[PDB]
Amino acid sequence: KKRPKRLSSQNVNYDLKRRKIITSEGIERSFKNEDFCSACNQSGSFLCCDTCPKSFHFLCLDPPIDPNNLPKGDWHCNECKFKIFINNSMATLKKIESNFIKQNNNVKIFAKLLFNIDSHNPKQFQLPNYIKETFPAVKTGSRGQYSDENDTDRQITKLDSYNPDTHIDSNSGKFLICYKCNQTRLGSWSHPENSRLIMTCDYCQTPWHLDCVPRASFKNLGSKWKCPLHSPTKVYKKINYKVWKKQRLINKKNQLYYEPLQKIGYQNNGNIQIIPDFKITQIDENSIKYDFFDKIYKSKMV
Amino acid sequence: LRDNIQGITKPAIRRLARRGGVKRISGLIYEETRGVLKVFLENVIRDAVTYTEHAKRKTVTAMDVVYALKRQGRTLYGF
Amino acid sequence: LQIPIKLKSVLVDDWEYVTKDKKICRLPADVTVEMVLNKYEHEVSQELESPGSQSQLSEYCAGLKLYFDKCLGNMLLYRLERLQYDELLKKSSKDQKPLVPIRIYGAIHLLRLISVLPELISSTTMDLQSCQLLIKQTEDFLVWLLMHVDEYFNDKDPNRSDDALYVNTSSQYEGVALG
Amino acid sequence: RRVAYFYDADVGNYAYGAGHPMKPHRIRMAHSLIMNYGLYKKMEIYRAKPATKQEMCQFHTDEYIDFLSRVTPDNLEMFKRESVKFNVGDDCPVFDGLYEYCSISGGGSMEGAARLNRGKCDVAVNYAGGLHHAKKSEASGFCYLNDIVLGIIELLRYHPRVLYIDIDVHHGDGVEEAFYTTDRVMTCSFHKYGEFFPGTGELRDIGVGAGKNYAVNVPLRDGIDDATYRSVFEPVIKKIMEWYQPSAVVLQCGGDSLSGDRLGCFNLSMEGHANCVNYVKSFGIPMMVVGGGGYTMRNVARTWCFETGLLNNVVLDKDLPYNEYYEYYGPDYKLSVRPSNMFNVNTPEYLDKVMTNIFANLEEEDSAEAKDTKGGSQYARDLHV
Amino acid sequence: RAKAKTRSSRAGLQFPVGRVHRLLRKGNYAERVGAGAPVYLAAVLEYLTAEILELAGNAARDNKKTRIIPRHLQLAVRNDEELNKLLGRVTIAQGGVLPNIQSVLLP
Amino acid sequence: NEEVTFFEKAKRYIGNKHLYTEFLKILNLYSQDILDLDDLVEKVDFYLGSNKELFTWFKNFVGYQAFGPSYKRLPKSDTFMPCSGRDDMCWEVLNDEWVGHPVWASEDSGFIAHRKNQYEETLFKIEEERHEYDFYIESNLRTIQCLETIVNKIENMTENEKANFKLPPGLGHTSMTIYKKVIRKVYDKERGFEIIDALHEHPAVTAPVVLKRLKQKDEEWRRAQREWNKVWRELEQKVFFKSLDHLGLTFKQADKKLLTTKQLISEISSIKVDQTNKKIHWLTPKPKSQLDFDFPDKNIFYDILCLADTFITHTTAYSNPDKERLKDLLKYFISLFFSISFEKIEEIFNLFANTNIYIFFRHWTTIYERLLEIKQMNERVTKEINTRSTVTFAKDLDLLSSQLSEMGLDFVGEDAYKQVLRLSRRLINGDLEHQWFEESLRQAYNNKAFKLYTIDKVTQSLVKHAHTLMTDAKTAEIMALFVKDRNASTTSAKDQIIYRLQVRSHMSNTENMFRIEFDKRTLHVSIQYIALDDLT
Amino acid sequence: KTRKESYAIYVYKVLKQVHPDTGISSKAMSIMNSFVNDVFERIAGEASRLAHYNKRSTITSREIQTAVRLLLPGELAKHAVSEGTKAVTKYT
């Protein structure tokens, strides 16, 4: 059992490998004794160039060519072919795009902005630095998607072992209390079936049980789980419609703005904040009582 | 501008080695000298760029170069 | 550039539709460059002076069309987004008709184009005096887009009505796109 | 009652991939547990029909079949474009025999559906198929061709209403996504909602349009025993059989739900897996049974033999008959294996809530294919050695 | 007052922000010290510590050792090119050197 | 009737400030006239679902008295995807609009496979080895019978048809892939195409040699498969039951960390603070508590002691009189707590005490409930060990002769309880190996009794929780006070308060006091972690 | 006797976060403590001379970022300041 050499098929092939001895002796008589895409930031079908070590995907090309038939000549690059085609060409000893302006008809506002896209590499949309720093809550991802509610290399639990964890707080030790049920229901070690799984929130640390809300999995390996007690990203109404796609968080030079309006009968399409277009006023509890009084007065006419 | 590693002149490298007391110079010395000068220059220039970008400045002063040389233990006087 | 905060929110929502929700805008777009450039042609002549900047605005629109024709596959058009660019040529290679993106692409691609222009003007010797009115015209475009946010840019979803200028991507187009 | 088995000689003669979890070894050796016991007294054996290009193509697209009928590992380089867009890349390895295995599996599925349609056979069981994780044009969940939806549209010719019960294999979704806006097809699946490779769906998926409140889905956690499986299976099935007036069952047995698998941990023994078909066989509604997966061929062959013995309304003995694959199973030599030591995580408060809100929301080419060559030459009677 | 919460937990860090701030203030490096400087320093130290300990564990995994010894730390430091460049003038006790033999020495 | 007090009542109910801001945002979102009735009722059911009186109070003003995150609709532009053979009603029942993706539910997180440890890994490795070798040999024998079928039909009569026997691909069968597959398997990378082409275009010539290169290969494969199956069955004899265990293998490391006092005090304090809240200003907290323990029989109070003495005679760490004094004190708690004078060894009364005796008693009922679970399946195991025996088809190569648990470790011929207690005593005495006990326990049972895998460990803790029971001054003092107050007849609310105030003022406030209420009615025992109404 | 400042528990919880089943000996842990102290001293000195260069009496996170870009070469600094960036993004 401890010697897999002779016990296995050593004469013919191996445990699974194909030894050469089938090809060596085959009793035959019928022969009668004689790279990486900087503009893609992904991985897949790469295509390089004969002049530069850079590579691009087969799909991001400006001429759409099907991947089952590669272009001939190993696809000389956009830079090299456009520097041997239009850029470095006749009428030397001067700047090439100076004579471009004299070749334009009925267009003058783009003096030199049409020659560059003629002789530049393919490139997908990458977010500008000022736009991505304009929203600090918006950040790039692993290869560069949008990542706000999602979620080093630089070149498990089966029994009642995790349920005792995440019950004693790491900071204070106080028991986190569930909302819908007033019992945390840790369970018994003598009877494991009394143990109940509880969850946590990555935003406001709200406790939630697995029985109050329907969950079965753990959304913690690539997407932050949001408890069903916050403002939704979009609402849906049925009575052509408005979904209220939040308003996003602006932070540059504190551009969120903070001023109390009358806060009632204002119709600011949501967009409120609590203190004890793109206009947001503060909300206190007094205006909450005011506009609920207005709402239940206008709702019940009889 | 895009290809300027040839701006370092081979007889200039010869003069630099003559200042160092070199009697005989091989032909493969020049390329390695250009490479080591390029990597040292880009290290010091990166340090000076970081120094002048901490101060919200777009021009590199001589004091930035002096402090960059002091960071690597190659402090130069006169500036 | 003074991009409006609402318009910045619209652009970030466009990025989140392209990347996370992973949806693709309609090839027969309801809105395109005609109902903005022709709107400028027949709109600015009723409240401003007849001579002066009218001809320069017209040639600016012509230059924007000529730039949008040859810039669609270069400065715009995300990795997922380029898929609809391919078969449009495949239809064009058999129907004996050249393809232009002038009549077929919406205003969000105009937003993308006017958002990628600051990072390429510094590559060449851009003349500031001849282009100051160009940043002025682009900021006119941002304030005009800040004016019209309801009847042009819709926030709807294709789950219940197909009038949101944005439809989902199936696993067929995911497989042939993200390969 | 009358039951029929569909089996081909070269149905286990394939190779799905070297070391890949799902295997084609499960079906053929299962037939070795059919004739060796003596179960052929009620077995109507029909060989799987070699379906052609356009005969089965009423569900999947033309280019999909044109790819799988002209792909070999020898010429994978010139077909690399369709390998990455049809989900036949690293998820599904490319081997010779894809088209023929898919054709015989689809032929067996159509034969079972048509034999249910005539009513000559009360129950049409077939383990040669069982591939349902695929969609209209993709091959996800280690399955290439969806072999249940063609059965659905085959029984839709006569039976206006069908009942699809999906025992957990790999969180199947093709049958659910194929019919979502139609009230004539009812889909349900008891499964595990987790971070699986093909896992889609949610409890909130109830149906839209005309198919509203007819596409229910019951999610469970990682690890459920037989008693809790019965307690969660009984009330929802009783409620939907009360409120639909059923006509046909296309329930699919779970191959990956047994104790011990490469992916998925579900604690059902032979009794727990048998009660799912016992509850729906107590009604007497005619039924066609689809086969399952199974990352371990021995356990899935044992539960398939137990299922085939159970459809004869008899209890097969707790001993396996001798065959050419007699040494595959465990040293106990018993058909009923013991359940694994999985902790019971499914608290019945969540199950009661699922029952409560489920009760709340619920209140060409010779088509109809029943032609294939007769078997009987696939004799699995070897001698002891 | 209120419940005491450390600044490391607010910033998602394990290294102490307050201890780094104390050593910065008592270390007479500057007259005034910003709030984000101890957080940034703690993050940098935590990242460097995690990278070095992960490299040491990787170098000790094939050595059948489940504990970090100074030889493992020396191997992790000198094996990485950027760690060798940063710790160019750094001597590690009880670590020795890398076990490399030149090609001319081997017959 | 009024609505102005509901807001402060809800503010007191929620408690947390930021959750109150979130509730305010949700209620304002409802107030600004875009939210339907379903959204507001489904949000109130989560915000204020703990109480139904305030819910029904809210419903008198307003209220009633589609799909999830996946399955998103596709437009009617890409549906014209021309699928041949589509019938009239095929478009009616099949819709391409609603499709679902795994990456849509994953939300850019990849896919993670649920893999086990190395035992299941090597089990799956040898399982796929078995699959590949069995598929190879069955394809080989199928090709033997296929090539033997098509030789007698053209070898019998004449020879002109031998030279010209042109056939379409398929070899006269419904199969279309298998024979080329095995020619590719048994030949080179470039040869197999021209061997199968010759075969196709010229049979009855290369057929005898392709049978010659397939018969002796089949017989060598059969012999190597027989020896492979021998070593394979020798492997399954150890790894069949080990692959069925996922929590008992980690139970050795688990029992070292969940048997501490901190885990148990956190456990009881969990239900203590579950009982503490939502019981003020409208209800009175009962003196009786939860976490009760039931003792159905009394024979389990002695048999574990047959191990316990067997431990301390085996352990050389303790001195000479330590063993006899431990036995004396343990017989003392046998005598006074259960009110039993003496019984043969088998092979409302309330007490106030502290943490160490509490966790000792907790592991006492843990072992008691482990043995209660063991005796719960004792009848069914003693029923079907008798049906468990070797078959008559396994005598070819002497299966079940690996000497795993045939030394008397099986449950045949005796009761399972007595045999497992004897096996645990053999573990205690050191005659039996630990892994041999683990294999015997996982073989004789259905892998349900995972709790007894570290029993010696826990009874070590037991004697430790006895050895420290009469070591320090404080626990010995309270034990002497309990013995002096033990008259086997205590009346409630008569003399227990004097003892409570005498024992509360002697210890400090750091060590909390717990109480045990035991009565003779079905041997009921309740444990309360009382913290209030004791210092007043 | 007297209390001594050390980086024991912090380095240990970082190690347990990145390697749950790998320990460390006393000598190597002293090496790691001295490494942390030396990198702290180097970054503090670089930030101090940066602040003295600009006549700045305040050392903020920008000084630490500049010091990490200066002393640490290659991309190893960059991820580090990226970590510092999200540290600030978690602090604010």
User: With contact defined as beta carbons under 8 Å apart, do F212 and A26 qualify?
Assistant: no
Best of A125, A132, A233 to mutate (most C CBs within 10 Å, chain C): A125
Report the CATH number at residue D255: 3.40.800.20
Best of D345, D351, D355 to mutate (most A CBs within 10 Å, chain A): D345
**What Rg value do the Cα atoms of chain A yield, rounded?**
34
How many whole angstroms from its chain centre is CA A38? 18
Residue E35: which residues within 8 A CB-CB, separation 6 or more? G91
List chains adjacent to chain E, taking adjacency as at least 3 C-beta pairs closer than 8 Å. Answer: A, G
Residue F469: which residues within 8 A CB-CB, separation 6 or more? F329, F356, F357, F360, F475, F479
User: With contact defined as beta carbons under 8 Å apart, do C158 and C168 qualify?
Assistant: yes
Chain A residues touching C83 at Cβ < 8 A: 59
CA dist list (Å): A279 to A138, A250, A271, D323, E28: 21, 12, 8, 79, 47
Which one, of F267, G34, D184, lies nearest residue A190 by Cα?
F267
Total of domains in chain E? 1
Other beta carbons less than 10 A from residue F30's beta carbon: 20
Task: Produce one character per residue of D93-129: b if its CB has 16 or more CB atoms within 10 Å, e if not.
Answer: bbbbbbbbbbbbbbbbbbbbbbbbbeeebbbbbbbbb
Per this entry, what is the length of chain A? Answer: 302
Q: Experimental method for this entry? A: cryo-EM
Q: HEC states along chain B?
A: CCCCHHHCCHHHHHHHHHHCCCCCCCCCHHHHHHHHHHHHHHHHHHHHHHHHHHCCCCCCCHHHHHHHHHHCCCCCCCC
Q: HEC states along F459-483?
A: HHHHHHHHHCCCCCHHHHHHHHHHH
Q: Do E47 and A152 touch (CB under 8 A)?
A: yes
- Identify the DSSP state of D11: G
Domains for chain B: give ranges and CATH numbers: 1-79 (1.10.20.10)
Dig out the tokens for F259 from the structure. 């048997």
How far apart, in whole angstroms, are the C-alpha atoms of residue F210 and residue A26?
A: 10
Question: What one-letter code names the amino acid at A172?
Answer: S
Q: Do A296 and F129 touch (CB under 8 A)?
A: no
Dig out the tokens for E60 from the structure. 């000790």
Chain D residues touching A16 at Cβ < 8 A: 18
- To the nearest whole Å, the CA of F78 is away from the closest chain D CA by 13
Assess if residue D105 is contained within a domain: yes
Chain E residues touching G56 at Cβ < 8 A: 30
Dig out the tokens for C39 from the structure. 């709107």
Q: Do E9 and A171 touch (CB under 8 A)?
A: yes
Burial class (CB in 10 A: 0-12, 13-18, 19+), B56: exposed
Antiparallel, parallel or unpaired: β A198-199 and A208-209? antiparallel
- To the nearest whole Å, the CA of C178 is away from the closest chain D CA by 9
How many whole angstroms from its chain centre is CA D300? 12
How far apart, in whole angstroms, are the C-alpha atoms of residue D369 and residue D55?
A: 9
Burial class (CB in 10 A: 0-12, 13-18, 19+), D325: buried
Burial class (CB in 10 A: 0-12, 13-18, 19+), D12: buried
Chain D meets chain F (3+ C-beta pairs below 8 A): yes
Q: Is G17 on the interface with A (CB under 8 A)?
A: no
Dig out the tokens for D166 from the structure. 């999906």
Dig out the tokens for F459 from the structure. 């009874």
How far apart, in whole angstroms, are the C-alpha atoms of residue D354 and residue D375?
A: 46
Grouping H, G, I as helix, E, B as strand and the rest as coil, residue D287 is strand
Q: How many CA atoms lie within 13 A of F442 on its CB side?
A: 24
CA dist list (Å): C122 to A39, A289, C69, D330: 20, 56, 22, 74
The chain D residue lying nearest F111, using CA atoms, is: D197
Task: Produce one character per residue of A257-281: b if its CB has 16 or more CB atoms within 10 Å, e if not.
Answer: eeeeeebeeeebebbbebeeebebb
User: With contact defined as beta carbons under 8 Å apart, do F405 and F443 qualify?
Assistant: yes
Q: Is D81 on the interface with A (CB under 8 A)?
A: yes
User: With contact defined as beta carbons under 8 Å apart, do D121 and D3 qualify?
Assistant: yes
Which one, of F91, C23, C161, lies nearest residue D178 by Cα?
F91
Total of domains in chain D? 1
Chain G meets chain B (3+ C-beta pairs below 8 A): yes
What residues of D are annotated to the active site?
Answer: 133
Q: Give residues 175 to 214 of A whose Cβ lies within 8 Å of C.
A: none
Grouping H, G, I as helix, E, B as strand and the rest as coil, residue E88 is coil
Rounded to 5 degrees, what are φ and ψ at A274? -115, 125
- To the nearest whole Å, the CA of G32 is away from the closest chain B CA by 24
Domain extent, residue C157, equals 1-179
Task: Produce one character per residue of C75-111: b if its CB has 16 or more CB atoms within 10 Å, e if not.
Answer: bbbbbbbbbbbbeeeeeeeeeeeebebbebbbbbbbb
The third-level CATH classification (topology) of the domain covering G1-92 is Histone, subunit A (1.10.20)
Assess if residue D25 is contained within a domain: yes
How far apart, in whole angstroms, are the C-alpha atoms of residue F403 and residue F394?
A: 16
User: With contact defined as beta carbons under 8 Å apart, do F429 and F310 qualify?
Assistant: yes
Total of domains in chain C? 1
CA dist list (Å): E60 to E90, E99, F243, G17: 21, 15, 29, 17
Assess if residue D373 is contained within a domain: no
Report the CATH number at residue E58: 1.10.20.10
Task: Produce one character per residue of F251-275: b if its CB has 16 or more CB atoms within 10 Å, e if not.
Answer: beebbeebbeeeebbbbbbbbbebb
Burial class (CB in 10 A: 0-12, 13-18, 19+), A200: middle
How far apart, in whole angstroms, are the C-alpha atoms of residue D139 and residue F469?
A: 66
Chain D residues touching F243 at Cβ < 8 A: 260
How far apart, in whole angstroms, are the C-alpha atoms of residue F411 and residue F445?
A: 9
Q: Is A94 on the interface with C (CB under 8 A)?
A: no
User: With contact defined as beta carbons under 8 Å apart, do D319 and D197 qualify?
Assistant: no
Dig out the tokens for A47 from the structure. 């295509």
Residue D344: which residues within 8 A CB-CB, separation 6 or more? A192, A193, D223, D224, D225, D228
User: With contact defined as beta carbons under 8 Å apart, do B54 and G66 qualify?
Assistant: yes
C-alpha dihedral, D107 to D109 to D113 to D114, nearest 10°: 10
User: With contact defined as beta carbons under 8 Å apart, do G89 and A136 qualify?
Assistant: yes
Candidates C9, C75, C90; nearest CB to A248: C9
- Identify the DSSP state of D218: E
- Identify the DSSP state of F293: B
Assess if residue D167 is contained within a domain: yes
Candidates C8, C124, C149; nearest CB to A134: C8
Angle at F511 between CA F505 and CA F517, to 5 degrees: 80
Angle at F458 between CA F431 and CA G19, to 5 degrees: 100
- Chains B and G: how many Cβ contacts under 8 Å? 23
Burial class (CB in 10 A: 0-12, 13-18, 19+), C33: buried
Domain extent, residue E105, equals 1-107
Lookup result for tokens 């903020």? G60
- The strands making up F524-528's β-sheet, listed across from edge to edge, are F349-353, F514-519, F524-528
User: With contact defined as beta carbons under 8 Å apart, do D269 and D340 qualify?
Assistant: no
Antiparallel, parallel or unpaired: β D3-6 and D44-46? parallel
Instruction: Find the helix or strand (DSSP H, E) in which D189 lies.
Output: strand D185-192
User: With contact defined as beta carbons under 8 Å apart, do C142 and C106 qualify?
Assistant: no
Please provide the distance, in angstroms rounded to a whole number, between the alpha carbons at the two ends of chain E.
76
